[PDB]
C-alpha cells in the first residue's frame, strides 16, 4: 500500500536516523534480531510503510544510509539495533569530505551518487506505489549538506510528484562548531528550496536548551538529542502506520502548511517533556498538552517564534483522547494571543488524531509549523556569510574543484529573496 | 584501510621519532619485539605472523645518532632497511644539505617512500618533522618536499617544524638556515606547526614544576601533541577529526598555513592530585599565553580561527559551555571577517601515561591548533636578526662555494617580506 | 556506539516510577 | 470550579506557607505522597480550589514557591510534606537579594520575574477560570518585598477583574531584626496601597505574646508562629472548601469590609487558643469564643484596637453552632462597648457559617476586620523613616542601584495621605 | 555553586590562615590528606575521588614562613600553587612592597586567582586577611586591592586587617606602613574589620586564663571568629544571613566601612564546668566594653550598626529577649539616626572545639560585627604617632629611594584628615 523510504546522509543524519529506526522497531515490536514480540494485531497490520519481508520472517528497514567515511558506518552497525539494516544498503566512502560543500557536491560526491542512486531505486520500485521519501541530514559539515542534497536533486528529477521530506540540522547559531559554518549552510539551502516539498528546521543548541531546563538532564549526550528528534519523528508518521479517528498523512501536511511552493520551511517540537521528578507530578491531559507546545522554550529550533507571526501550522495528537477539546483548546489559544496569528487565514493550524499513543505514553502531540519567525535564524547565517565575502574567506577549496563566485552570488540572491519574501507577510 | 606515513628528517627528527613512536607503541600495546600480548592499522603494518612495523622513515646525514637507534632497544621494532643514514652531516649548512652532500640520499629515501606507501589505498598524507635551525633538518627537508610535491601532489603533507627560539639558538648561522628553509616551506607545505624550543623549556618549568630536564623531556610533550592529534583517526569519538580535516579548516589563504599549538594539562602527579580537570578549566588554560608552545604572544595578535580537539571522558555539553565562555571573554579577540572561528573534535580514549615521563595519568586532555596574525612578530624578530647578519658578509663564503649563488639569499628575503605584507593585510 | 545513548531519556519518556 | 493561586514571597513566605499546606493537607486528609485518606466526600468534592488533579490519582498544589536564594527551598522540600510541591513550581535565584528593596525589585529581581510570570500563567490559564490569588510574603525582607511586589504589580495588569489577597509580615518595633526595615516596609506599602485589593498584617512580636499569654508554651520556634498564621489563614477560606448554612468567599469580605479603595489594611485574629494544661478546663461555647475574640492579646498585630475604632469588621465562624448566638452576640458586643465602633455603619459586624470545623476542634472562628488602630503602625514606620532621612544615611545602595530620590519622597507623601485618611474616621 | 575565595598576605595572614583552615578542615570532617572518611563546596573544591582542596591563597615575599607549610603536617592539603612566595622580604617598607618587588609576584597571584575563581559561577566574594604593620603585608596587600578592583568590579571584598595595636607593636615604622595602607584601602575594600593584638592578649589573659600565650593562641580565636561569620553559608540555619548580608546592613556610607569584632564566650572547660551559658549572658559578655577585639572602648563612642551571629542550639526567642535588654540599658548608646540597630542570624550547627587548643565545647556562641564612631579615636592616636615621626623627616629615604616619591605621604595625611572629620560629622 503506502511506503516510506528513508535516506540518511552524514554521520549526524545517520546517528539521529538510526534512533528513528530504534523507536519504530520499538513501536512495532520488532526485536534487534528481527522477530516480532508483543502479540498484537494493531502493532503489525501496517509494517510495509517502513519494512520489507525478507523471506526469513525478518522485517528489514527500507533505509539507505550513505557516508563518505566508514568510521561512522561501522559504529552504527556495531551498536545496538544496528544489525537490523541490510549490509548492502550501507554506502561506503573511502576519500571523505573535509566539511566542504564543493567536494560533497561535485568531485567525489558525484563519484558516490552513481552507487547510491541505484540502491534507492531498487527499494523504491519494489513496492506497488510509494508514498514519499524522507531525508535526515545536517548542513554543518560536507558529506551531509553536499551529497545528501545532491541525492535530493536526483530523486526530484526522477520522481517529481512524490513528496520530499527532509529534516536538516542547521548549524547552531551562537555556539559554532564546524568552523566553515555559513558556506555549508547557505550553499545547500538555495539548491534545497527548489527540490524539497517539506523541510523541518531543527537546531542543536535548541535541543541543548530543552535538555538543560525542561528535561533537566545533568549530562545531555548526543544520544539524548537524537531521541528528542526521534520522538518528534514518530508523531509525523503515526497515522501512516496506525489508524485514527481523523487521519493525516505527509501530503495532508504539505497542502495545509505551504500556500506557495517557494516556502516549505517548518518548525518541529514535541510534547509531553518533563523531568524525572516532574513527570510524577504533572497532569497529562489535553489542556496541559497544548500550551507547552505553543511556547518558544519547547521549540527544537533556536529561532524564537514569538518575535514573528504564525502563518500556518499543525498538531498531530496521539493516544486514547477525545476530539472536542482537540479543537476547543486549539481555538482558545487562537483567541487569547490573537496578535500572534496571521489575520488572513482560517483557523490557521490544523488538527489530527492518531489512536495509538507513543510507547509508554497515553497522550502526546507533535507539531509542524510554517512561521515567518524563522527570519532571525536565516539572517544570522546571512550576515555571517556576508562577513565571509567581505574579504573572500576559504575560497580555494571551493574554486579549484569545479565552481565559481557566480554561484556564490547566486547563493546570496536565492537566499536574500526568501528573506524579502518572508519579510512581506507581516 | 587508512594510513599516515611519517617523515623524520634531522637529528631532531630522529629523536622525535624515538619519542613519538615510543608513545604510539605504549598506547596501542605493542612490545619492542613488534608483537601484541584494527585501530592500530593507521600507524603500524601487518607483517608476517602478528608483527607490526612502523610506517615512518628516519632520514639523517650523520650515523652517530641513527645507528645508535638501531643498536639500542627498538632495533627489532623498525625495519633494518628503514633507517637511512648518510656518511657525513651538513653541519648547519643549507647549501650542502640541499645541493651537494644531500642529493645522494634523497633517491634512497624516496625509494622507501613509495615502497612503504604502496601498501593500501586510503593514505591520508605524510607527517614530516624537521629542525629548522639545523643543517640537515632544513637541508634534506627542503628537497624531500619538492620531490614529494612532484610525485604525490594532492596528498596532505602536514609538517611539524621545531622552529628556533629568539635568544635560544645553540647556533650562530641560524638566521641563514631558517630563511632558506622558509623559502622552501611556503610553496610546498599544506599544514605547518610551530615549535619554539624555549617555550617548551618554560611550559615544563612552570607547569610540570621540573626545573632542569633535558631534550628528551621536551620530546614527551611533543609526542603527546601528535598522540592527541592523530588518535581521532584511530579510535571512536563523538566528533572524529581526520588529517584531511585540518587543512580544510585551518588555512584561509594558501600562504597563511603557519599554525601554532598548545596543550593542557601539562600537569605532574602532584598537581593532578589536587585540581579537577573540568572542560572549562582545561580550555582557558590552553589559551593562557604562558602555555603557548612557540613564545608568540597572542594578546596583540588577532586570531583567524582555531581547532580545539579533546580526549577522554568529555561530555559535549561541557564542550559547548567551555567554547562559549572563551567566546564571550574580552581578552581574546577575533578577526571580524571570521566570526565563527572554532572547530571542536572529541575522542574517547584517554591519554596513556608513559612511565618515567613527567606527565601524570590524565583523565581528559586538550590539543589545540590555532592560526592568527601574531606570527608577524615571530618572523619580524628574525628579519632584523638576518638583515643585520647579511650586512657585512657573515658566513657566506661557505654558502657561495658549496653549490648556490648570491641572489637566492635576496629572493628568500623578498618572499619573507611578501608574507610580512600578507600577514598585515589579513589583520587590517 | 558511544556516539549514541538513550538510557536516561528512554526512562524520562516512560511514565514509570522506581 | 474556582481555584485560588498561591504565591510564596521570600524565604519567610516559603516557611509560613509551607505550613499553610500542613493544615490544608491535614484537613483534606492527604498522604505526603499525595494519596487521599479519610474516606469522606466533604474534602475532595471541593479539592480543586487549592489543588490540581495530577492524573496519578494525587493532587499537586497550585502554589508558586519563590525566592532569589536557593537555600530555603532545600529546607521546605526536605521537611514533612516536601514530596507535595512540584519542582517546576519552584523558582530560584542564584545570587540572593541581601534584604534590599532596590536590587530586589528593579535590577537583581527583575530577571526572575519573567519566568515567575510564566509559571503563574502556567496554572491560571490551565483551568477554566480562577477565583483569585493569595500572596504570603515579607515586608522586612528584601526579596519577598522586592520581586514579590513586582509579582503583585504585573498580575494586576494581567487579570484586573480578579481579586488578590495578601498576608504580609510587617517589621516590628521592639526586636528590630533585619535592621533595614523601613526602606523595604513603607515602599512596599507605597506600591500596594493602590495596587493591592485586600491586606492582612501579621506581626512576629504579636505572635510571640499570643503564644506567651494564651498558650503558655515555653519554647516555640518559627513553626509554632507559622501554625498560628496558618490556622487563621485557612479559616478565612473555609467556605470554598466546605459547605455551610451561610456561605461567603473572600470576595464577600472584600466588598463588605472596605468602603473605600484607598483603605484596605486590616487585622486577623484566631480562636480558640487554649493551652494544653487548660484544654480540659476550657468550655467551648460561642459566648466564650467571641468574648475571647475581641481582645488585644488575641490579636495578630502589635496595634491596640482599643486606641482606635473599628471601621467594618467580619468573622468566619466554623463548626456546628446555633445561628442566633452567632447573631445576638455579634450584636451584644456592638451594644456593650459601643464606643469602640464607628457610628455611621449600622450593624458593623458580619458573619458566616462554614459547617466543617478544623480537625480536633468542634468549632472555631477567624476574624478579619478593619481598624483605625492600624494608623499607629504606619506612623511608627513613618517617624522612624523621617528620623533617618533627616541624616540621609543608608541610601547609597538605593540611589546606586539605578533609582532616584523622587520616589522616596513620593513614598513618604503617599502614606502620609494614608495616615491622614485614617485620621478622619476617629 | 556558591563559594568564597580566601586571600592571605604576609606572615601574619599566613599564620592566621593556617589555624583558620585548620578549623575549617576539622569541622567539615576532612583529614590532612584532604579526603574525608554537599554543604562544603563554599570553601572546598571537590577535585577527584573524595579529595578536596581549599579555595585559598597564601602570599608572602619571603619563603621563610611558607616553606614549612610545604614541609608540615598540612603538606598535601594545600596544593602548592596556591602557596606562592617571593625571594626578598619587603622589610617594613610600603615602597618596596607596592612599587619595587610586588610587581613580579602580583601577576603570578592574579593568574592563580582567575584560575581558581572562574571554575564555578555564583561566587560570593573575597575573604582577604592581611597585616598593615608589616612591609609585605601592607605592600602586596594594598597592591592586590587595586587590581582586584579593576578586574572584579561588583564583588564584595571582606577585609580583616591586623591594625597595629597602640603600645605593643613590635616595630618602629608602623606609622608609615599603616597610614599609607589605609590611605588606599579606603577606596578599595568594601568592609574592613579591625584586629588588634593587645585586645586578643587581654582576652587570653583573663578569659581563658593563660598568662604566657603565643601567637597561634591568638590564631585560634580569630579562626573561631571567621568560622562563626561564615557558618551561615556552610550550615543550615533559621535565619540564614549571608556574607553579602553583612555589608548591606552595616555600612551606612561608602566611606564608613570600618568596624570592630568581638567573640563570646571565650571560656575554657574548667569554667564551662561551672558557668551555664544563657543566650542573654553570652550577648552581654560580648557587649562588655573590655571584651572588644580592637582595643576600642565604645563608652566614649556611639554605635551606628551591629550584627549578631548566633550558632548552636539557639532558640529565636532568646535572640529577641536578649536584644531587648541590651537596648534598654543605658551603658550602651545608639546614634539618633539609627533607631533600629540589629541584624540577627541563627545557625543550627554547634561551634568548634579543638583538643590541644584552649577553647572549650560550648552549646551556643556569639560573633560580633560592630560599627562604632569610636574608631575616630583609634585613628586620632595614629595621627599623634605619625605627626611626631613625620615632623623631623625620619625614615624617609627608605620610601623615596625605591619607586614612590614625596607626595603620597602628604596625600595620606590629608586622606586621614578628611576621613577623621567625616566621622564626627556622621556622629552629630
Ligand atoms: N623540539 C626539539 N628541538 C630540537 C631537538 N633536537 C634538536 N632540536 C633543535 O635543532 C637545532 C639544531 O638542529 P639539530 O636537530 O640538533 O641538528 P640537525 O637537524 O641534524 O642538523 P645539523 O645541525 O646540521 O646536525 C637546535 O637548535 C634545537 O633547537 C629535539 O629533540 N626537540
Ligand atoms: N595576631 C597575630 N599577629 C601577628 C601574627 N604574626 C605576626 N603578627 C603581627 O604582624 C605584625 C607585623 O607583620 P608581620 O606578619 O610580622 O610582617 P608582614 O606583615 O608579613 O610584613 P614584613 O614585616 O615586611 O614581613 C607584627 O607586629 C605582629 O604583631 C600572628 O600570628 N597573629
Ligand atoms: N543532533 C546531532 N547533531 C550532530 C550529531 N553528530 C554531529 N552533529 C552536528 O553536526 C554538525 C557538524 O556536521 P557534521 O555531522 O560533523 O558533518 P556532516 O554530516 O557532513 O554534515 C555539528 O555542529 C554537530 O553538532 C548527532 O548525533 N546528533
Ligand atoms: N512568622 C515567621 N516569620 C519569619 C520566618 N522567617 C523569617 N521571618 C521574619 O522575617 C524577617 C526576616 O526577613 P527574611 O525573610 O529573612 O528576609 P528575606 O529573605 O529577604 O525575605 C524577620 O523579621 C523574621 O521575624 C518564619 O518562618 N515565620
Ligand atoms: Mg645535521
Ligand atoms: Mg615584607
| B370 close to B335: Cβ distance less than 8 angstroms | no
Mutate one of A79, A103, A176, A395 to test the B interface: name it (highest B CB count within 10 A).
A176
Cell 576539622 maps to which residue? E26
B177 is in an annotated binding site: no
Binding region of A: 11-12, 15, 138, 141-144, 177, 181, 204, 222, 226
CA-to-CA separations, D395 to B369, D326, E248, in angstroms, rounded = 53, 52, 11
Cα(B328)–Cα(B339) distance, integer angstroms: 12
Neighbours of E418 (CB within 10 A): 12
Contacts of D54 in chain A (CB under 8 A): 281-283
Cell 498544589 maps to which residue? D61
Q: Could you tell me the three cell numbers for E12?
A: 601574619
Cα(B216)–Cα(B221) distance, integer angstroms: 9
Neighbours of B369 (CB within 10 A): 22
Cα(B88)–Cα(E87) distance, integer angstroms: 49
Contacts of C6 in chain A (CB under 8 A): 19, 22, 223-224, 226-227
Separation in Å, CA of B193 to nearest CA in chain C: 30
| D353 close to D248: Cβ distance less than 8 angstroms | no
| D141 close to D181: Cβ distance less than 8 angstroms | no
| E262 close to E298: Cβ distance less than 8 angstroms | no
Listing DSSP states for A312-336 in one string gives EEEEEEEES--SHHHHHHHHHHHHH
Provide the b/e sequence for B383-407 (b: ≥16 CB within 10 Å): eebbeebbeeeeebeebeebbbeee
Contacts of E315 in chain D (CB under 8 A): 219, 221
CA-to-CA separations, E292 to D396, E137, E164, E263, in angstroms, rounded = 29, 24, 15, 8
Ligand 6 centroid distance, CA of E198 (Å): 22
Cell 513618604 maps to which residue? D412
* B127: nearest Cα among B136, B118, B135, B117: B117
Q: Kindly list the partner chains of chain E, i.e. chains with 3 or more CB atom pairs below 8 Å.
A: B, D
CA-to-CA separations, A267 to A15, A167, A187, B32, E130, in angstroms, rounded = 21, 10, 21, 58, 59
Cα(D6)–Cα(D230) distance, integer angstroms: 13
Measure the CA angle with vertex B375, ends B369 and B379; round to 5°. 135
List, in sequence order, the alpha helices (H) in B80-214.
Answer: 94-98, 103-117, 135-151, 174-185, 197-205
| A34 close to A60: Cβ distance less than 8 angstroms | yes
Cα(A194)–Cα(E244) distance, integer angstroms: 60
* D85: nearest Cα among D75, D95, D93: D75
* E193: nearest Cα among E264, E284, E261: E261
Closest CA in chain D for residue E243? D98
D284 class by beta-carbon count within 10 Å (0-12 exposed, 13-18 middle, 19+ buried): middle
**Omega prior to A44 cis, within 30 of 0:** no
Cα(A282)–Cα(D56) distance, integer angstroms: 8
| E151 close to E76: Cβ distance less than 8 angstroms | no
Which member of A71, A388, A393 has the closest CB to residue B240? Answer: A71
Neighbours of A356 (CB within 10 A): 19
* A314: nearest Cα among A375, A372, A236: A236
Q: Could you tell me the three cell numbers for D145?
A: 518585598
| E101 close to E125: Cβ distance less than 8 angstroms | no
Q: Could you tell me the three cell numbers for B146?
A: 619538492
List, in sequence order, the alpha helices (H) in D214-297.
Answer: 222-235, 250-257, 286-293
Would you call A13 helix, strand, or coil by DSSP?
helix
Contacts with E318 (C-beta within 8 Å, 6 or more apart), sequence order: E278, E279, E280
Cα(E360)–Cα(E368) distance, integer angstroms: 19
CA-to-CA separations, A223 to A54, A177, A207, A219, A366, in angstroms, rounded = 29, 18, 11, 11, 20
- Ramachandran angles phi, psi of D100, nearest 5°: -120, 125
* E354: nearest Cα among E209, E224, E222, E218: E224
Among this protein's residues, is B245 annotated catalytic? yes
The 8-class DSSP code of residue B301 comes to S
Cα(E386)–Cα(E179) distance, integer angstroms: 8
- Listed in order, strand segments (DSSP E) in D108-255 are 132-138, 163-169, 199-202
Q: How many CA atoms lie within 13 A of A150 on its CB side?
A: 26
CA-to-CA separations, E80 to B206, E11, E76, E77, E83, in angstroms, rounded = 12, 17, 8, 9, 5
Q: Could you tell me the three cell numbers for E77?
A: 592539603
Listing DSSP states for E87-106 in one string gives SS---S-HHIIIIISSHHHH
| B208 close to B194: Cβ distance less than 8 angstroms | no
Cα(D29)–Cα(D359) distance, integer angstroms: 10
D222-235 and D20-27 helices cross at what angle (nearest 10)? 50
| B315 close to A219: Cβ distance less than 8 angstroms | yes
B207 is in an annotated binding site: no
Ligand 4 centroid distance, CA of A43 (Å): 59
* A307: nearest Cα among A211, A192, A193, A426: A426
B135 class by beta-carbon count within 10 Å (0-12 exposed, 13-18 middle, 19+ buried): buried
Provide the b/e sequence for B153-176 (b: ≥16 CB within 10 Å): eebbbbbbbbbbbeeebebebbbb
Neighbours of E103 (CB within 10 A): 12
Strands B3-9 and A370-371: unpaired
Cα(D228)–Cα(D205) distance, integer angstroms: 13
| A232 close to A300: Cβ distance less than 8 angstroms | yes
Beta bridge partners of B193: B160, B259
Mutate one of D78, D174, D179 to test the E interface: name it (highest E CB count within 10 A).
D179
Cα end-to-end span (Å), chain C = 27
Q: Could you tell me the three cell numbers for D209?
A: 505574646
| D30 close to D70: Cβ distance less than 8 angstroms | no
Mutate to test the pocket of ligand 4, among D109, D146, D169, D227 (most ligand atoms within 8 A of CB): D169
Contacts with B88 (C-beta within 8 Å, 6 or more apart), sequence order: B61, B62, B101
The 8-class DSSP code of residue D310 comes to E
Cα(B39)–Cα(B103) distance, integer angstroms: 37
Beta bridge partners of A265: A199
Neighbours of E172 (CB within 10 A): 11
D19 class by beta-carbon count within 10 Å (0-12 exposed, 13-18 middle, 19+ buried): buried
Q: Could you tell me the three cell numbers for B137?
A: 633538518
| D63 close to D8: Cβ distance less than 8 angstroms | yes
Measure the CA angle with vertex B89, ends B88 and B94; round to 5°. 135
Measure the CA angle with vertex B225, ends B222 and B231; round to 5°. 135
Beta bridge partners of D354: D318
- Listed in order, strand segments (DSSP E) in B139-293 are 156-162, 191-194, 258-264
CA-to-CA separations, D92 to B56, B340, D80, D82, D96, in angstroms, rounded = 59, 34, 21, 16, 9
**Omega prior to B265 cis, within 30 of 0:** yes
Would you call B183 helix, strand, or coil by DSSP?
helix
| D278 close to D224: Cβ distance less than 8 angstroms | no
Length of chain C: 18
CA dihedral E169, E172, E177, E180 (to 10 degrees): 110
Neighbours of B272 (CB within 10 A): 19
Contact yes or no for A222 and B238 at CB 8 A = yes
* A382: nearest Cα among A420, A336, A335: A420
The 8-class DSSP code of residue A405 comes to T
Three-state SS sequence of A148-187:
HHHHHHHHHHHCCCCEEEEEEEECCCCCCCCCCHHHHHHH
Cα(E216)–Cα(E19) distance, integer angstroms: 7
What experimental approach yielded this model? cryo-EM
Order the strands of the E303-312 sheet from edge to edge.
E83-85, E56-60, E3-9, E123-131, E156-162, E191-194, E258-264, E364-372, E303-312, E343-347
The 8-class DSSP code of residue B293 comes to T
Q: To what resolution in angstroms was this structure determined? A: 3.5
Would you call E10 helix, strand, or coil by DSSP?
helix
CA B73 from centroid of its chain's CA atoms:
25
Order the strands of the B191-194 sheet from edge to edge.
B83-85, B56-60, B3-9, B123-131, B156-162, B191-194, B258-264, B364-372, B303-312, B342-346
Q: Which of B27, B245, B408, B414 is catalytic?
A: B245
Which H/E stretch holds residue E128?
Answer: strand E123-131
Would you call B396 helix, strand, or coil by DSSP?
helix
Measure the CA angle with vertex E328, ends E322 and E332; round to 5°. 95
CA E181 from centroid of its chain's CA atoms:
15
* E239: nearest Cα among D209, D97, D100, D72: D72
Strands D310-319 and D363-371: antiparallel
Cα(E329)–Cα(D351) distance, integer angstroms: 47
Cα(E248)–Cα(E365) distance, integer angstroms: 23
Would you call D2 helix, strand, or coil by DSSP?
coil
CA-to-CA separations, B40 to A244, B17, B76, B351, in angstroms, rounded = 54, 17, 18, 15
Cα(A256)–Cα(A140) distance, integer angstroms: 30
Contact yes or no for C9 and A222 at CB 8 A = no
| D183 close to D146: Cβ distance less than 8 angstroms | no
Contacts with E15 (C-beta within 8 Å, 6 or more apart), sequence order: E65, E215, E216, E219
Would you call B371 helix, strand, or coil by DSSP?
strand
Strands D4-9 and D132-138: parallel
Q: Could you tell me the three cell numbers for B194?
A: 610551530
CA E141 from centroid of its chain's CA atoms:
13
- Ramachandran angles phi, psi of D76, nearest 5°: -80, -15
Cα(B296)–Cα(B273) distance, integer angstroms: 31
Cα(E81)–Cα(E104) distance, integer angstroms: 16
Strands E56-60 and E52-54: unpaired
Show me where chain B is broken: residue before each gap, C-N > 2.5 A.
37
CA-to-CA separations, A190 to A156, D31, D105, E149, in angstroms, rounded = 15, 60, 49, 52
* B129: nearest Cα among B118, B140, B116, B120: B140
Cα(E116)–Cα(E122) distance, integer angstroms: 13
| B11 close to B19: Cβ distance less than 8 angstroms | no
* D397: nearest Cα among D188, D10, D107: D107
Evaluate the CA torsion angle D379, D385, D390, D391 in order and state its sign: positive
Question: What's the Rg (C-alpha) of chain C?
Answer: 10
Cα(B72)–Cα(B76) distance, integer angstroms: 9
Contact yes or no for D55 and A283 at CB 8 A = yes
- Listed in order, strand segments (DSSP E) in D232-287 are 265-271
| Maximum alpha-carbon separation in chain A | 64
**Omega prior to A272 cis, within 30 of 0:** yes
Cell 547609597 maps to which residue? D396
The 8-class DSSP code of residue C4 comes to -
Contact yes or no for D122 and A291 at CB 8 A = yes
Ligand approaching nearest to the C-alpha of E242: 4
Which H/E stretch holds residue B282?
Answer: helix B279-286
Would you call D266 helix, strand, or coil by DSSP?
strand
Cα(A268)–Cα(A365) distance, integer angstroms: 11
SS3 content of chain C, % helix, strand, coil (to 5): 20, 0, 80
Length of chain A: 426
| A103 close to A401: Cβ distance less than 8 angstroms | yes
E340 class by beta-carbon count within 10 Å (0-12 exposed, 13-18 middle, 19+ buried): buried
Ligand 5 centroid distance, CA of B91 (Å): 5
Cα(E373)–Cα(E395) distance, integer angstroms: 32
| E132 close to E163: Cβ distance less than 8 angstroms | yes
Q: Could you tell me the three cell numbers for D125?
A: 490559564
Amino acid at each position: 500500500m503506502r511506503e516510506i523510504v528513508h535516506v540518511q546522509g552524514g554521520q549526524c543524519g545517520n546517528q539521529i536516523g538510526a534512533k528513528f529506526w530504534e523507536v519504530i522497531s520499538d513501536e512495532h515490536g520488532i526485536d534487534p534480531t528481527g522477530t516480532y514480540c508483543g502479540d498484537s494485531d494493531l502493532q503489525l497490520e501496517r509494517i510495509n510503510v517502513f519494512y520489507n519481508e525478507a523471506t526469513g520472517g525478518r522485517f528489514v528497514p527500507r533505509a539507505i544510509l550513505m557516508d563518505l567515511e566508514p568510521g561512522t558506518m561501522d559504529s552504527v552497525r556495531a551498536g545496538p539495533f544496528g544489525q537490523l539494516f541490510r549490509p548492502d544498503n550501507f554506502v561506503f566512502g573511502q576519500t571523505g569530505a573535509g566539511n566542504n560543500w564543493a567536494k560533497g557536491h561535485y568531485t567525489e560526491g558525484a563519484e558516490l551518487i552513481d552507487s547510491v542512486l541505484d540502491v534507492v531505486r531498487k527499494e523504491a520500485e519494489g513496492c506497488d506505489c510509494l508514498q514519499g521519501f524522507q531525508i535526515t541530514h545536517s548542513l554543518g559539515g560536507g558529506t551531509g549538506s553536499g551529497m545528501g542534497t545532491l541525492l535530493i536533486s536526483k530523486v526530484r528529477e526522477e520522481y517529481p510528484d512524490r513528496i520530499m521530506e527532509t529534516f536538516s540540522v542547521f548549524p547552531s547559531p551562537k555556539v559554532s562548531d564546524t568552523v566553515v559554518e555559513p558556506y555549508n549552510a547557505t550553499l545547500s539551502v538555495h539548491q534545497l528550496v527548489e527540490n524539497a516539498d517539506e523541510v523541518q528546521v531543527i537546531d542543536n543548541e535548541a535541543l541543548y536548551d530543552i535538555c538543560f531546563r525542561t528535561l533537566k538532564l545533568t549530562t545531555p549526550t548526543y544520544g539524548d538529542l537524537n531521541h528528542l528528534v526521534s520522538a518528534a519523528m514518530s508523531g509525523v508518521t503515526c497515522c501512516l502506520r496506525f489508524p485514527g479517528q481523523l487521519n493525516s498523512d505527509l501530503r495532508k501536511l504539505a497542502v495545509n502548511l505551504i500556500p506557495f511552493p517557494r516556502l516549505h520551511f517548518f518548525l518541529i517540537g514535541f510534547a509531553p517533556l518533563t523531568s524525572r521528578g516532574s513527570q510524577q507530578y504533572r497532569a497529562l491531559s489535553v489542556p496541559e498538552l497544548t500550551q507547552q507546545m505553543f511556547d518558544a522554550k519547547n521549540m527544537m529550533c533556536a529561532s524564537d517564534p514569538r518575535h514573528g507571526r504564525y502563518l500556518t501550522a499543525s498538531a498531530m495528537f496521539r493516544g486514547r483522547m477525545s476530539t472536542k477539546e482537540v479543537d476547543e483548546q486549539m481555538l482558545n489559544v487562537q483567541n487569547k494571543n490573537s496578535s500572534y496569528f496571521v489575520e488572513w487565514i482560517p483557523n490557521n493550524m490544523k488538527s489530527s488524531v492518531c489512536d495509538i499513543p507513543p510507547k509508554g505514553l497515553k497522550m502526546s502531540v507533535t507539531f509542524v509549523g510554517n512561521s515567518t519567525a524563522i527570519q532571525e535564524m536565516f539572517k544570522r547565517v546571512s550576515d555571517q556569510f556576508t562577513a565571509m565575502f567581505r574579504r573572500k574567506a576559504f575560497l580555494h577549496w571551493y574554486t579549484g574543484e569545479g565552481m565559481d563566485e557566480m554561484e556564490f552570488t547566486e547563493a546570496e540572491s536565492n537566499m536574500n529573496d526568501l528573506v524579502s519574501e518572508y519579510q512581506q507577510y507581516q | 584501510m587508512r594510513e599516515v606515513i611519517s617523515i623524520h628528517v634531522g637529528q631532531a627528527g630522529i629523536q622525535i621519532g624515538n619519542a613519538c613512536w615510543e608513545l604510539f607503541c605504549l598506547e596501542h600495546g605493542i612490545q619492542p619485539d613488534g608483537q601484541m600480548p584494527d585501530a592500530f592499522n593507521t600507524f603500524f603494518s601487518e607483517t608476517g605472523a602478528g608483527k607490526h612495523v612502523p610506517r615512518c622513515v628516519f632520514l639523517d646525514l650523520e650515523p652517530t645518532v641513527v645507528d645508535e637507534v638501531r643498536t639500542g632497544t627498538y632495533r627489532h621494532l623498525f625495519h633494518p632497511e628503514q633507517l637511512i643514514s648518510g656518511k657525513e652531516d651538513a653541519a648547519n649548512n643549507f647549501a650542502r644539505g640541499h645541493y651537494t652532500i644531500g642529493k645522494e640520499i634523497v633517491d634512497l629515501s624516496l625509494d622507501r617512500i613509495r615502497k612503504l606507501a604502496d601498501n593500501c589505498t586510503g593514505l591520508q598524507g605524510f607527517l614530516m618533522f624537521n629542525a629548522v635551525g639545523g643543517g640537515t633538518g632544513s637541508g634534506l627537508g627542503c628537497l624531500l618536499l619538492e620531490r614529494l610535491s612532484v610525485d604525490y601532489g594532492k596528498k596532505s603533507k602536514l609538517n611539524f617544524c621545531s622552529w628556533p627560539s629568539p635568544q635560544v639558538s645553540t647556533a650562530v648561522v641560524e638566521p641563514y638556515n631558517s630563511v632558506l628553509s622558509t623559502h622552501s616551506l611556503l610553496e610546498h607545505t599544506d599544514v605547518a606547526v610551530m615549535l619554539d624550543n624555549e617555550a617548551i623549556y618554560d611550559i615544563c618549568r612552570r607547569n610540570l614544576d621540573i626545573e632542569r630536564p633535558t631534550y628528551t623531556n621536551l620530546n614527551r610533550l611533543i609526542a603527546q601533541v601528535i598522540s592527541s592529534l592523530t588518535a581521532s583517526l584511530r579510535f571512536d569519538g563523538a566528533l572524529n577529526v581526520d588529517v584531511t580535516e585540518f587543512q580544510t579548516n585551518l588555512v584561509p589563504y594558501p600562504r597563511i598555513h603557519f599554525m601554532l599549538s598548545s596543550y593542557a594539562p601539562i600537569i605532574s602527579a602532584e598537581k593532578a592530585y589536587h585540581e579537577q580537570l573540568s572542560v572549562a578549566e582545561i580550555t582557558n588554560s590552553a589559551f593562557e599565553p604562558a602555555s603557548m608552545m612557540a613564545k608568540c604572544d597572542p594578546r596583540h595578535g588577532k586570531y583567524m580561527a582555531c581547532c580545539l580537539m579533546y580526549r577522554g571522558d568529555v561530555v559535549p555539553k561541557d564542550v559547548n559551555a567551555a567554547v562559549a565562555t572563551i567566546k564571550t571573554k574580552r581578552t581574546i579577540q577575533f578577526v571580524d571577517w571570521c566570526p565563527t572561528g572554532f572547530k571542536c573534535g572529541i575522542n574517547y580514549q584517554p591519554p596513556t601515561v608513559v612511565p618515567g615521563g613527567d606527565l601524570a595519568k590524565v583523565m581528559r586532555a586538550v590539543c589545540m591548533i590555532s592560526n592568527s596574525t601574531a606570527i608577524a612578530e615571530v618572523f619580524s624578530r628574525m628579519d632584523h636578526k638576518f638583515d643585520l647578519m647579511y650586512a657585512k658578509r657573515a658566513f657566506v663564503h661557505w654558502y657561495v662555494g658549496e653549490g648556490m649563488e648570491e641572489g637566492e639569499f635576496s629572493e628568500a628575503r623578498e618572499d619573507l617580506a611578501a608574507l610580512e605584507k600578507d600577514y598585515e593585510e589579513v589583520g587590517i | 556506539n558511544r556516539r549514541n545513548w538513550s538510557e536516561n531519556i528512554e526512562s524520562l519518556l516512560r511514565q514509570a516510577t522506581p
